[PDB]
Design a protein around this ligand. Structure first.
Ligand code: CA
Length: 223
């Protein structure tokens, strides 16, 4: 996250870290046994780490559970990143309390102007790299689809939305991928892509979760 602030330990209880020997992507806990992340974060041998603040220190609230299965969206296109969403089922259910909790899926899509919370352990610099050990947060508004398509001509589909600052300076970045974009207590987006990080007129693009609720619900019900 570039230009954000330190969230504070366990203040984002649905945030998960996907680990394959190291942290490589974020995700969101939607119920005790399922996590949603970005399809581009797919790989085999994933361990989901919940209750984390410092990913390099066991502080006491962590739950490390391996994934039993991953399901990438049937129409995921890795060249365009259209339908960039995946579901991960945990081998056992996590124990939910105040520091580890699930986030609700949305009943309606959010509108441009809505302020959201984006979090993750990704890069904090727009040029160069510096990866934080504790969770960073950023409050950003969803931008109009017109502004979004104008910043990324020929690249935004109906399954994507932009959120951020056209002026630059504040944005999600590499390492934040798969993480949550929560607006009014509902999961509205997943950190997907962008041109660089925090660059002027190149806001972050996010998977529009409201368009996948039926797929999520039907998949969980049958697996
Ligand atoms: Ca830790």
């Amino acid at each position: 996250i570039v230009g954000g602030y330190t969230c504070g330990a366990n203040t984002v209880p649905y945030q998960v870290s996907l680990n394959s020997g190291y942290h490589f992507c974020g995700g969101s806990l939607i119920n005790s046994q399922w996590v949603v992340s970005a399809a581009h974060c797919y790989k085999s041998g994933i361990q989901v780490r919940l209750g984390e603040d410092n990913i390099n220190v066991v502080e006491g609230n962590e739950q490390f559970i391996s994934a039993s299965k991953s399901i990438v969206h049937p129409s995921y296109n890795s060249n365009t990143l259209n339908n960039d969403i995946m579901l991960i089922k945990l081998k056992s259910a996590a124990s939910l309390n105040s520091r580890v909790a699930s986030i609700s899926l949305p009943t309606s899509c959010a509108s441009a102007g809505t302020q959201c919370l984006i979090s993750g352990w990704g890069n904090t610099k727009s040029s160069g790299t510096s990866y934080p050990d504790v969770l960073k947060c950023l409050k950003a508004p969803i931008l109009s689809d017109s502004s979004c398509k104008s910043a990324y001509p020929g690249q935004i589909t109906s399954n994507m939305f932009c959120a951020g600052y056209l002026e630059g300076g504040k944005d999600s970045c590499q390492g934040d991928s798969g993480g949550p974009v929560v607006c009014s207590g509902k999961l509205q987006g997943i950190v997907s892509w962008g041109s660089g990080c925090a660059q002027k007129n190149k806001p972050g693009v996010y998977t529009k979760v409201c368009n996948y609720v039926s797929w999520i619900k039907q998949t969980i019900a049958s697996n």
